[PDB]
Design a binder for this molecule. Structure first.
Ligand SMILES: *Cc1c(COP(=O)(O)O)cnc(C)c1O
Ligand SMILES: *Cc1c(COP(=O)(O)O)cnc(C)c1O
Ligand SMILES: *Cc1c(COP(=O)(O)O)cnc(C)c1O
Ligand SMILES: *Cc1c(COP(=O)(O)O)cnc(C)c1O
Ligand SMILES: [Br-]
Ligand SMILES: [Br-]
Ligand SMILES: [Br-]
Ligand SMILES: [Br-]
Ligand SMILES: [Br-]
Ligand SMILES: [Br-]
Ligand SMILES: [Br-]
Ligand SMILES: [Br-]
Ligand SMILES: [Br-]
Ligand SMILES: [Br-]
Ligand SMILES: [Br-]
Ligand SMILES: [Br-]
Ligand SMILES: [Br-]
Ligand SMILES: [Br-]
Ligand SMILES: [Br-]
Ligand SMILES: [Br-]
Ligand SMILES: [Br-]
Ligand SMILES: [Br-]
Ligand SMILES: [Br-]
Ligand SMILES: [Br-]
Ligand SMILES: [Br-]
Ligand SMILES: [Br-]
Ligand SMILES: [Cl-]
Ligand SMILES: [Cl-]
Ligand SMILES: [Cl-]
Ligand SMILES: [Cl-]
Ligand SMILES: [Cl-]
Ligand SMILES: [Cl-]
Lengths: 391, 391, 391, 391
C-alpha cells in the first residue's frame, strides 16, 4: 500500500542510525581509514559506499533508495532543481546529430533548454500535440533519440495516452529513450516506469517538498538507462545538498495525506467552476470532458491540486488587476505543490507563444490555480468574490 | 583592506533585516502582491528583485553581492558544486564548432567534462603546458572561443604566468573568453579579473565553506560576459540552496584568518620537506624553486595550504599501505580547504594519465597534502613518523 | 475554518519578506542602527521588536503570533522542549510556601519536576483523580497557587470534565493559575483558554513538528498571566532556536490534514481492538465507553492518534520481547505525533508507581499505540500478527 | 597542543560515520530494535546510549565529548543559551535555606536570576568584590552552598585571583560548589577545573559559535558534581537542538586561530586607547595596569577580544548618538565573540546599579568594545573618527 510505502521508503538503520529519519551527513570529504577502504569506496562510488560528497552521503543514499522504491527504478539521480533535472537528463542522452521529440505542452523552461541550449550543440527538437497517441510513429526520424512526455501538460493540463505513445515509439525505435516530466503526479499517482517509459523526472520542489521552501530535481531511471544517466549527470556536477535531500525524504511521509486533500479540494473547485456562468472551460485531468480525462481515469491512481480554467471573456489590463490584486486567500506566485493556494493569469497569445508549431483553441483569459490545504468553502468564496469583481 | 572587506561583504540591511548575517529565506514561490509588482519582479528577475527561487532569494543575493565585491566582478552565478560551476560556465560560452584551449594541469573532472561531454557536442579541446606563457599565441585557432586556466595547477601545483598568457591571447583573439579555476586562491589571493581574465570560477566547497561540510560552486564574471553566463547557466537550472549560500557567506568572514594560518603552516612544512633526505621535490607555489614560483610571488597576495611533494622512491603497494594507513593526524579524503589536514598518494603514471599530450618529469610517488589548522609541530611529527615507516 | 487558519497563521509580510514561509533569522546580536532605535527596542523588548536573540528574532515572532491566534492567547512563550515548558511554566508562578494541585495522570516528568525540584524549594504538591470534576473544590488549600490539568491523561487517556473543574476552582480560589498540558489535542482540538484555563502548554515536539525530528515546548497564556510567564521564563533563559521555531510554524500548515487521518485510522484500530478476544479494555477518548469519552465528545473538535489498550494478560519479559521485537511496521520509541506508528508497553505495576495516591484498575499489560499515516489495513495486520505471537 | 585538540575533539567514527564532522541526528523518538536494546538504553540513558532526544542524539554526544576533553570535565550539560546554563546550573545545587555568594561583577541576568527567582524560593544571595581574594573566607556562611565567580567580570573586566579564592573556600567550606562563568576565555584560555573550580559555565553563543548566529549554553562539571548537575538540569527539561550542537562543535575547529587574532588586535587597540587624550582608563586583562592583570598573566594562556574603556567625560544622550550612530565599521548590538566588531555604551550610574553593595570608581561613560576580525588599522581609524565627534 502506497501510504505504508511512503512512510517507510529509504528508512533503514544504516541511514537513520537510531532516529526515525535519516541522519543529515554534510560532507565534501569522506574519510578512508585505509588504502583498501579507499579502493572499495572507489569501486562502489555510485553504489552507496561513501566516496565523495559530489556522489552523495548517507542522506542522499536514503533519498535515492526511497525514490527507486516508490517509482520502481534502478537508480535515482539528484539535481539542484526540477529544471536542472530536465535539462541534464535530456543532455545525458544526446549528442550532435540527434533529434528530440517533445510534447508542445512541455514546461516552458524545458522547451527553452531545447531551443536555446541543445540546438546550438547540434541536437534538433521537434514537437507533437499531446493527444497524438499512436500517430507519434509518423514523427519518429532515423535520428530520433529521445521522446519527451509531460502528462498532464503544463498550464493547459492535457493528459497523454501514454500506452499508445509508448507502443508506437517501441514499434519504430525500440531503443529510443522515453522520458516524462512526472511532477504533477509527484511520481506516485502515475507509475511511469511500469508503462515502459525509461526515465521519470520530477521537480521535487513541488509536492515532494510540499511546503514551497526547497528546490530539488530527481530522475529515476530503469536499468537500461541508469548508468548513462548517473555518469553523465555527474560529469556536469549535478547534485543536491544533504539538507534538501533530507527535507525531500521528509516530505514523502505526508505526501499521501496531502495529495488526497489536494485531489478532493481541487476536483470540488473544478466541478463548481464547470457550472459557473463566467467560466468557458475547465482544464482539470480529473474533470469529465477535460482533454485526455479518459487516460487520467485509466492510468492514474489519483489527482493533485493544480489545474486551470478559461474565463468567458478576455480580461482587459484593468480587469486583470481588479481580479488578481484583491484575493484574500489565493496569492500570486510561481511554483505550486505547497500548502497554500495560488493564482496566475495568462492571455491566449501568451500560451500560443509557448505552444510551438501550434495555436490555442480558446480566446478567454486563462487562470491557473493551485488548490492548497485551506478550507475549500473559503477558497470558493474567494473565487466567487473574484468573479464579482469582473462580472 | 581584505580582512575588513571579508567581514562586511554582502551584509546590508535589506538582506540581514537586523541580524549580523543575512536571513535564510527558503523559497521556490515568491509572492507578488499585485500585477504591477509581478511585472517589476519579472523585469528585475536577474537584478536582485524577488521573482522565483531558481533565480535566488535574499540569501543568494547577499552572497552574490559579496562575491562580486571581493572578486571585482559584475555578477556571480551559483552552482551545486565546483564541478558544476566549471562544466556549466564553459558550456555557457560554447557551441558546435568551437574550440577550448585548457591547461593540461586542469582538475581531472574539468578535463573529463571536456573530453566526455563537450566533444560529442561538437566542441573540441586542446591542451597546453602550464608554463607556456606568451607562446600560447601559437595554439590559438580561428575557432578558439575559450581559454581555460588553472593556477596553481591541480595536484602538481604549477603556477601560470597569467599576464603573459592574457596578453598573448588578447593579441590574437581579443574577444576570446578567458576563464580560470581560482579555487586554490579562494578567489581572493589572486585577483583574476584585475589581470584581464573574464570569469573566475571557484569550488566554494573548499576554502570559502572552510569546514568540509558543504558543496557549492561560484563563477564571477566581468560586465562583458555576465549576461551570457547568467542566462545560459539558468537555462541549465543551475542554482544552490539558500542554506549553503548562507554558509558560504558565513565562511567568508573567517577566510582571512584561516588562510594566513594555512599559508604559515604549509610553507613551514614545505620548507622542512625540501630539506628532507626522503623527498625528491616539493611542489608548493610559495616555495622558492617551485614551478612558476616567481609568478606566485609577483601576482598573488598569499598562499593557501594545499601542495604536494615527490618521494625519493616509488613506493610499493605494501609501502603505500604502511605509509598511509598509519597516520595519527593526517587523514585520507578527497577535497581540501577545511580545518583538518589531509594526505593522498598518486604514482607517476596516474598523473601522466591526467596530463593530456604530456608526460611527467618525476618517477617517485607523489604525495598531496592539505595543511589544516592543527599545530604544525604535531603535523611535522606525523610526517616524520610516516617517513620512518618507509625508510 | 481551522484549515485556512492553520495555513495562514503567523504569515505576515514583515516575517515572510516575499516568501511563503517566514524567513529564518539566526541571531544572538541584533543590530541597532542608532541610539534611538536601541531605546525603542529596549522599551519593546518583550513586544516583538528586535532586541536580542534570547528574546527572539523575526522567526520566533512569527511562530508566537501563530500560536496566539490558534490557541486564543495574549502571548506564547517558547522553550527547548515540552518538559522545559511544563517545568518552567509552573516555576514561573510558584514561590516558597505555595501548593500545586496536579492530576495523578500527569506526564511522569511533570510529576518528577514537582516531587524532586519544587519540593526542595518549599513548594508542595497534591494530587487528584482525573475524573474528580467538581469535587476538586475540597482539595484546594488556601496556599494552592496552581491547578495543573492534563486531558487526556498520559498513557491511560482519561479525559477530565474541564468545565466542572474550572468552575469549582473559580468558586473556591478564583485567583489560582489553572494550567493544562494540551499536547494530545495539539492545542487545537481542545480550545483550553476558551474554557477559562489560564495557560495551555504543549510539547510542540509531538504533533506540531509532526515528523519526530525536533523538540520544542510552547505555553500560551491569557492576558492575566502573560507578563509573569514571559518575564520569569526569560529569567531562566528559556528560548528555542530559530530553525526549530521555523519547523514548528511549518508543521502547523499540515496539522489539520494530519490530525484527520490520525483520528480516522486510530478510531478504526480502537474499534477493532475493542472486539478482540485478547483485549481487556481500550482507552481511546473517541471510543464510546472510554473514561471521560462523554467529555471528549462535548468539549473537543476531534481526536489525535495516540491511545492505549490493555491485554487480557500481563506479559512476562519473554513474552514482551516476542510481541514487541517482531513487529514489521510499528516501532518502539518514546514520543509520538509523527508520521509513523509506534508501540510501547507499560506493565500495570509501572503505571501504578506513577499514579500517586492511587491504584490501577486493570491487571494486563498496557500497550500504548501511536497510529501514524500508514495504511490502516496494514497496521491491523501487524497488530494481528502480534496477537498471534502471545496467544 | 590546543590547536590540534580543537581540530579533533569529539570527532570519533561513531559520531562522524565517514564525514569529517559529526552527523546531524535530529530526533525526539529514538528507536529500540528490541526490548533488550531498550533496557540497555534505559540503564545508560545518561551515559551516551541513544534513548530519547531530550537526553541527546549522536550530535549532542559528540559535542559533550569535545567539551569534556577541552575543559577537563567528567560531563557537559547543554542548555538553550548561556543565561539558561547559569540559571539552571545554580538551581541544580540549591534548596530552600541555602545561600549563594556571587561576584558583584557578574553578568546582570545572572544577578537578576538570583534576586528575582532564587529569593522567592528561599535561597538568599550575597556579594563580593572581584578582587577580594582570600578575604572571601569571611563572607562564607554555614549555609553557603554556591560560590559563583566570573573572571574577567562583565563589562568592567576585573580578573579574580582564583587560586586565592578557591583556597579560602576550601579552608572554610570544602563541600561548597564553586562555579565560574568562563565565557570570556571560551573555556580554553582559563582551565577552570584545573584550579579546583567545580563547574565551568559558558555562553557558547559567544566565541564557541563565533558568528553571532546561534545560542547555546554549556556547563562542564567535575566528577563530584556531574550527576547532580545532569539530573537536575534534565528535570528542568534543559537541552539544545541538534543543529546548534553541530554548529558549536564546528566553531571549536577555528577557535584557536580566531582567538589569537582577537587577542592581537584587541591588545593593539587597548594600547592605543591607553595613550589617548580622550581616554581615562582602559580595562583589558592583557594590558599592564588593568585590574587583575597580574592574575591574567599568571593564570590564563591568552586573551579574547572583548574589553572596555572609560572616556574622559560622561556623554550626554545627544553626544552618545553623535558618537555611536556614525561609526562605519563598529556596530551596536548585544553579545560578542563573533567576527565583527561591536560597540556599546554604559553610563557610570548604569554600572553602579548592577554592582550590588558597591560603587563605581570612574565618572566617564564606559565603552565596551568587541574587536572582531577586521583590519586593525581600519578599526583604529573608526575609533579616531568617533573621538573627533565628541571632542
Ligand atoms: C516547476 C516545474 C519544473 C521546474 O522545477 P524547478 O524546481 O522550479 O526548477 C519542472 N517541471 C514542471 C512540470 C514544473 O511545473
Ligand atoms: C575540488 C575541485 C573542484 C570541484 O569542486 P566540487 O565542489 O568538489 O565539485 C574544482 N576545481 C578544483 C581546483 C578542485 O580542486
Ligand atoms: C512527550 C511529552 C511531553 C514532553 O515533551 P518533550 O518535548 O519530550 O520534553 C510533555 N507532555 C506530554 C503529554 C508528553 O507526552
Ligand atoms: C552573553 C552572556 C551570557 C548569556 O549568554 P546567552 O547565550 O546570551 O544567554 C552569559 N555570560 C556572559 C559573561 C555573557 O556575556
Ligand atoms: Br495507490
Ligand atoms: Br519522418
Ligand atoms: Br504494454
Ligand atoms: Br510496458
Ligand atoms: Br493517494
Ligand atoms: Br517560472
Ligand atoms: Br498578469
Ligand atoms: Br459559493
Ligand atoms: Br590583500
Ligand atoms: Br594553429
Ligand atoms: Br595589462
Ligand atoms: Br589587464
Ligand atoms: Br590573507
Ligand atoms: Br574526486
Ligand atoms: Br593509494
Ligand atoms: Br621534526
Ligand atoms: Br473549523
Ligand atoms: Br546607548
Ligand atoms: Br521518557
Ligand atoms: Br597548547
Ligand atoms: Br519493554
Ligand atoms: Br542584555
Ligand atoms: Cl510554475
Ligand atoms: Cl580533490
Ligand atoms: Cl506585515
Ligand atoms: Cl512519551
Ligand atoms: Cl568510535
Ligand atoms: Cl552582552
Amino acid at each position: 500500500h502506497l501510504d505504508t510505502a511512503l512512510v517507510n521508503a529509504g528508512r533503514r538503520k544504516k541511514y537513520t542510525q537510531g532516529s526515525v529519519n535519516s541522519v543529515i551527513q554534510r560532507a565534501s570529504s569522506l574519510v578512508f581509514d585505509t588504502v583498501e577502504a579507499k579502493k572499495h569506496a572507489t569501486r562502489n562510488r555510485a553504489k552507496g559506499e561513501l566516496f565523495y560528497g559530489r556522489r552523495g552521503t548517507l542522506t542522499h543514499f536514503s533519498l535515492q533508495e526511497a525514490m527507486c522504491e516508490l517509482e520502481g527504478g534502478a537508480g535515482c539521480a539528484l539535481f539542484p532543481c526540477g529544471a536542472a533535472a530536465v535539462a541534464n537528463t535530456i543532455l545525458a542522452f544526446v549528442e550532435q546529430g540527434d533529434h528530440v521529440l517533445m510534447t508542445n505542452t512541455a514546461y516552458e523552461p524545458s522547451q527553452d533548454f531545447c531551443t536555446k541550449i541543445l540546438a546550438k550543440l547540434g541536437v534538433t527538437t521537434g514537437w507533437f500535440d499531446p493527444l497524438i497517441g499512436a500517430d507519434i510513429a509518423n514523427l519518429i526520424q532515423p535520428n530520433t533519440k529521445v521522446v519527451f512526455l509531460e502528462s498532464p501538460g503544463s498550464i493547459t493540463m492535457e493528459v497523454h495516452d501514454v500506452p499508445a505513445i509508448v507502443a508506437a515509439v517501441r514499434r519504430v525505435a525500440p531503443e529510443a529513450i522515453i522520458m516524462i516530466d512526472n511532477t504533477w503526479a509527484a511520481g506516485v499517482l502515475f507509475k511511469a516506469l511500469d508503462f515502459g517509459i525509461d526515465i521519470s523526472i520530477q521537480a521535487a520542489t513541488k509536492y515532494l517538498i510540499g511546503h514551497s521552501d526547497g528546490m530539488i530535481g530527481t530522475a529515476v531511471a530503469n536499468a537500461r538507462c541508469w548508468e548513462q544517466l548517473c555518469e553523465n549527470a555527474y560529469l556536469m556536477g549535478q547534485m543536491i545538498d544533504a539538507d534538501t535531500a533530507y527535507m525531500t525524504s521528509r516530505g514523502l511521509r505526508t505526501l499521501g495525506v496531502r495529495l488526497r486533500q489536494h485531489h478532493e479540494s481541487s476536483l470540488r473547485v473544478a466541478e463548481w467552476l464547470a457550472q459557473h456562468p463566467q467560466v468557458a472551460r475547465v482544464n482539470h485531468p480529473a474533470l469529465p470532458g477535460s482533454k485526455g480525462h479518459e487516460f487520467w481515469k485509466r492510468d492514474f491512481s489519483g489527482s493533485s491540486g493544480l489545474f486551470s480554467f478559461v474565463l468567458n471573456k478576455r480580461l482587459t489590463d484593468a480587469e486583470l488587476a481588479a481580479y488578481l490584486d484583491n484575493f484574500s486567500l489565493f496569492s500570486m506566485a510561481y511554483s505550486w505543490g505547497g500548502f497554500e493556494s495560488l493564482i496566475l493569469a495568462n492571455q491566449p497569445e501568451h500560451i500560443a507563444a509557448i505552444r510551438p508549431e501550434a495555436e490555442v483553441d480558446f480566446s478567454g483569459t486563462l487562470i491557473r490555480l493551485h488548490i492548497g490545504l485551506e478550507n475549500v468553502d473559503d477558497l470558493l468564496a474567494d473565487l466567487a468574490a473574484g468573479f464579482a469583481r469582473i462580472v
